[PDB]
């Protein structure tokens, strides 16, 4: 029951590895890798385009510039964590 199950686990894991090695040789991790960097920049530059959306040369620069700062100020990240802890409690 224990030795046999150990043998089953070993034979199954060594067979899963002996197929992931083939998949790496043919190439499938590259699709996953080159997709995560894609949305990384699509989470990147595409936020930079919106950071110039309110550079006004109708008066949202007074408040919206602070809304962006507050969201990523480590204050709106800890306040929400405290609220989630309270909700759990």
């Amino acid at each position: 029951s224990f030795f046999v199950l150990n043998l089953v686990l070993g034979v199954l894991s060594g067979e899963f590895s002996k197929e992931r090695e083939k998949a790496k040789a043919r190439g499938d991790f590259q699709k996953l890798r080159e997709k995560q960097q894609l949305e990384e920049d699509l989470k990147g530059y595409l936020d930079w385009i919106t950071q110039a959306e309110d550079i006004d040369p109708r008066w949202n620069r007074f408040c919206r510039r602070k809304c962006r700062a507050a969201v990523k100020s480590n204050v709106f990240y800890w306040l929400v964590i405290f609220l989630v802890f309270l909700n759990t409690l």
Partner: protein, 324 residues
């Protein structure tokens, strides 16, 4: 030897008496020639083995042979560069003692015609295009921020307005913005004898933008004496080829868009319209990276502005300070 001792220290004292002397103009070198064999200078310095297109701006109206000066780096010491006529007349002097410089050969044919080599191996003709020695530039260097596409087209300058906000925040005490509605890529002051100056003089080059495109050479160059790269909005350089020929040689900064797949949703996020040009904004973009930096030596492969602006900041953090 009273002759050597009585003067030799002349340069040593006059390059330090007015240590706060203000520099002007500029120099763009082309040959780094040493001076162990080519000293010919009262500074007793080794040589001028600096580089091609070296960074130093000079105003000390010295004698008609050499120009005692200053080099801009981490140290604010004084330097020395030869006068333009010196480099002109000596660029052949280093090849004046080149024996068979004219046409006779040393290939065992000694006595065919003999005679001194013809004067054409001198500055008698030198007429490639009559290209002069060291070229001036502003007291600073002009700025180009190429990318991500044809400037002024929705996203294109919108990647620059955001980049010019922290820039103006770091600047504004350093800022010298201007917006040029003229084509430097179609502007070159290397005219034959005289550029167009009149308005209705009825000449073959009267109704030409050259008159109103060279008018901002004065809005650049020595106007930068207060020290400032002077950025611009120029919808002129979509490639560091036409700009980097004349005495401009601008600060070309490239905002990278990485692989040609993140810009798709960067330009299509606005949906309809933006594909009026379709290809070029995604074709001219890699038509730029195509060639090496060196011009746009600056590259800006970076995410959200917080660190992306730092690359511009650290470039000019050393650059601004090391220019005094």
């Amino acid at each position: 030897e009273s002759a050597r001792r009585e003067v030799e220290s002349q340069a040593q004292q006059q390059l330090e008496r007015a240590k706060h002397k203000p520099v002007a103009f500029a120099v763009r070198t082309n040959v780094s020639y040493c001076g162990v064999l080519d000293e010919e200078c009262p500074v007793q310095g080794s040589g001028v083995n600096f580089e091609a297109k070296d960074f130093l701006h000079i105003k000390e109206k010295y004698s008609n042979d050499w120009w005692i000066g200053r080099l801009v780096k981490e140290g604010g010491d004084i330097a020395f560069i030869p006068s333009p006529q010196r480099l002109e007349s000596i660029r052949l002097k280093q090849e004046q003692k080149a024996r068979r410089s004219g046409n006779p050969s040393s290939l065992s044919d000694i006595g065919n015609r003999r005679s001194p080599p013809p004067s054409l191996a001198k500055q008698k003709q030198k007429q490639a295009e009559h290209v002069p020695p060291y070229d001036v530039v502003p007291s600073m260097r002009p700025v180009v921020l190429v990318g991500p596409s044809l400037k002024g087209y929705e996203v294109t300058d919108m990647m620059q307005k955001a980049l010019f906000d922290f820039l103006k925040h770091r600047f504004d005490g350093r800022i010298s913005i201007t917006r040029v509605t003229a084509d430097l890529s179609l502007a070159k002051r290397s005219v034959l004898n005289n550029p167009g100056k009149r308005t209705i003089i009825e000449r073959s080059s009267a109704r030409s933008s050259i008159a109103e495109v060279q008018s901002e050479i004065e809005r650049i160059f020595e106007l930068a004496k207060s020290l400032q790269l002077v950025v611009l909005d120029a919808d002129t350089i979509n490639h560091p080829a036409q700009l980097a020929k004349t005495s401009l040689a601008p600060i070309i900064v490239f905002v990278k868009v990485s692989s040609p797949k993140v810009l798709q949703r960067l330009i299509r996020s606005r949906g309809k319209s933006q594909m009026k040009h379709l290809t070029v904004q995604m074709m001219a973009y890699d038509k730029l990276v195509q060639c090496p930096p060196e011009s746009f030596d600056v590259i800006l492969d970076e995410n959200q502005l917080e660190d992306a602006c730092e690359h511009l900041a650290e470039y000019l953090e050393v650059y601004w300070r090391a220019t005094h």
